[PDB]
Ligand binder design. Structure first.
Ligand SMILES: Cc1cn([C@H]2C[C@H](O)[C@@H](COP(=O)(O)O)O2)c(=O)[nH]c1=O
Ligand SMILES: Cc1cn([C@H]2C[C@H](O)[C@@H](COP(=O)(O)O)O2)c(=O)[nH]c1=O
Lengths: 68, 68
């Protein structure tokens, strides 16, 4: 299907007046395992924007640091 | 094209070929530093695409993870 499916949405960091969003989601390319993704999303969610993907350790490393 | 890593906050990742995924305060092209997350060469002269965040966007992120 060659597409990016938001498996799960976690958080919404911002939103511009045009209705795009900065989100943190678990996102799945082409049926591959869902990775952690912080990215700009269009209102309907069809078009996505720029942003990084994270492996588990990266995210986990990250959140543990925002924690102690 | 110019940038500036003004503060390094956290390193999330090694890499087989020495890249590092980092959370930083980066300024691009003379613009005020924003919080920024991407991959960096071992010599931080090359990078991949990545997300940048306002501070409100960044704290919104940190908060949420402190609280789950
Ligand atoms: C045109 C341009 C913009 N930027 C700025 C605008 C964005 O805030 C951010 C995205 O860089 P990169 O990821 O494509 O950096 C660059 O780093 N490099 C460029 O060549
Ligand atoms: C000098 C230079 C910088 N950049 C910036 C913008 C991106 O955030 C990052 C690399 O992105 P890229 O993978 O799309 O080229 O570095 C380029 O994309 N191309 C260039 O030629």
């Amino acid at each position: 299907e060659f597409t990016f499916e938001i498996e799960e949405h976690l958080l919404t960091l911002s939103e511009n007046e045009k209705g795009w969003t900065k989100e943190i989601n678990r996102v799945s390319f082409n049926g591959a395992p869902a990775k952690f993704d912080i990215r700009a999303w269009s209102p309907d969610h069809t078009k996505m924007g720029k942003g990084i993907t994270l492996s588990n350790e990266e995210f986990q490393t990250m959140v543990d640091a925002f924690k102690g």
